[PDB]
DNA sequence: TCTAATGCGAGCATGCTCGCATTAGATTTTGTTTTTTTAGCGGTT
Ligand SMILES: Nc1ncnc2c1ncn2[C@@H]1O[C@H](COP(=O)(O)OP(=O)(O)NP(=O)(O)O)[C@@H](O)[C@H]1O
């Protein structure tokens with residue numbers, strides 16, 4: 001199923017998501033994986049914010065991913081990481 | 090580097106221009122023209 005959360009800048013979408021994930025961490029710390037997919041220059045920020053709960057003070061079930069990092073983990077599981085890769089140069 | 094002043098003598102109409110040579114001075118730039126894209130690390134050695 002899909003959910004389109006839409007609103008102008010300042011709507012509170014990101015905090016709404018942060019809080020959603022936090023509550024879902026409260027309910028079941030070992031539940032099914034929760035993937036937070038953000039731009040690469042936004043991975044750390046969210047990681048910090050999720051970690052800022054007096055309740056839990058961290059995350060385990062839920063990770064923050066870039067497209068690249070997500071590719072790294074899923075490929076670590078599924079395979080195909082053997083081949084070397086080429087920098088742009 | 091070219092323009093101007095200084096000196097001297099020959100031809101002309103004893104004093105005057107003119108030729109020539111030469112040096113010495115001073116006098117002196119302006120201008121303008123771009124952006125290049127494209128998604129932070131890495132826990133474990
Ligand atoms: N319920 C709330 N009440 C007051 N301030 C809030 C609330 N939720 C979030 N904020 C603040 O609002 C600011 C922006 O929240 P955010 O979650 O980024 O909204 P947003 O929809 O993502 N805006 P944007 O990312 O620019 O499109 C932050 O400074 C939050 O601390």
Ligand SMILES: [Mg+2]
Nearest residue numbers: 012013014015
């Ligand atoms: Mg936001």
